Write a protein that binds this ligand. Structure first.
Ligand SMILES: COc1ccc(/C=C(\CC(=O)O)c2nc3ccccc3s2)cc1
Ligand SMILES: COc1ccc(/C=C(\CC(=O)O)c2nc3ccccc3s2)cc1
Ligand SMILES: [Zn+2]
Ligand SMILES: [Zn+2]
Lengths: 183, 183
């Protein structure tokens, strides 16, 4: 009922009082995809497959509306079913996929670019890739012409990097075993 | 090369010639996180845990810079290590996590809202949750006061839904076994 002084962040206890246990109706839900719009799928496919080691697991074309969907994931290309319906059902039940939306023609348009969400207006910030070694990964990214937002040892938090994809989306490069030393 | 008629997107063959096999240096890379900025973590935690059945697996507070990070995932809460360093290392090596960024004070600012990327300027579009039954999941979402962008049987592609979270970010609700029927 009383006005309170500026809280600050939530306490661990406040955050937890806002959390409910998983209802049994949600028990088989999984976080399947993140969708990003890409100007030029040729550049995006080369980046995500060659630079980041992802596999293209499904491509969907919509001839009438004139757009394509590309699903990228860290999956063994030998696990991709060969039959069309089984393939789509396997691809779209993989956890942690990246869905790239290509609105046909944007690749031919000098002015068009997508917004990465890290300048006004902000919202989405980044995807993040966990790697065994941020320094070796980033050395290879440098050699392959990758643009950096943050080199691993530049700024406050060392051993953490941000690169950008061909559309300028930020990608965090993190070692899960080194994040405790920043927290 | 000669000037071409308007883009028909890539052929399956063109898309494949833009893909490289995974370099051995990337072999342990995994798509770990998607980061979204949230105005009010009380509302976002309630939505992602109670409505969507995700588990809060890690909370990080930065008292001096004045922001919190919340990591949400489809994980069994009994798998969360209890000790701080082992917990962070386990949380930040989970596939398919959602990272919510709370810039302290945004919850106390009448005017402030984040941009969902689905109006100018566009980029990020959505996350997507794979569910065993889109219609039962959506019936429950309706009963829980969830705002819809697309009801499963509205629009051209039926059996697919979009809801929005408390910040207005779009969330696709999909059955992997029904997506082949939309191609
Ligand atoms: C663009 O520059 C930066 C530099 C550091 C960060 C810090 C991050 C990444 C993020 O905020 O998403 C950190 N994340 C974690 C997660 C766990 C433990 C410590 C950190 S610091 C973010 C952006
Ligand atoms: C906002 O309204 C819609 C309605 C349908 C769609 C269609 C989608 C979702 C998307 O574009 O990410 C489809 N995704 C797939 C994936 C595989 C096969 C078919 C489809 S249709 C998108 C937005
Ligand atoms: Zn989607
Ligand atoms: Zn992050």
């Amino acid at each position: 009922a009383e006005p309170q002084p500026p809280s600050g962040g939530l306490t661990d206890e406040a955050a937890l009082s806002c959390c409910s246990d998983a209802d049994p109706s949600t028990k088989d839900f999984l976080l399947q995809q993140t969708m990003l719009r890409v100007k030029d799928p040729k550049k995006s496919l080369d980046f995500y497959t060659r630079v980041l080691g992802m596999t293209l697991i499904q491509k969907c074309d919509f001839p009438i509306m004139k757009f394509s969907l590309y699903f990228l994931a860290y999956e063994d290309k030998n696990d991709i079913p060969k039959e069309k319906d089984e393939k789509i059902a396997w691809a779209l039940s993989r956890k942690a996929t990246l869905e790239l939306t290509h609105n046909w023609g944007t690749e031919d348009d000098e002015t068009q670019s997508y917004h990465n969400g890290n300048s006004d207006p902000r919202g989405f910030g980044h995807i993040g890739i966990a790697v065994p070694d941020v320094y070796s990964a980033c050395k290879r990214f440098e050699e392959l012409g990758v643009k950096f937002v943050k080199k691993p040892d530049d700024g406050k938090m060392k051993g953490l990097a941000f690169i950008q994809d061909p559309d300028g989306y930020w990608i965090e490069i993190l070692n899960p075993n080194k994040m405790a030393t920043l927290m």
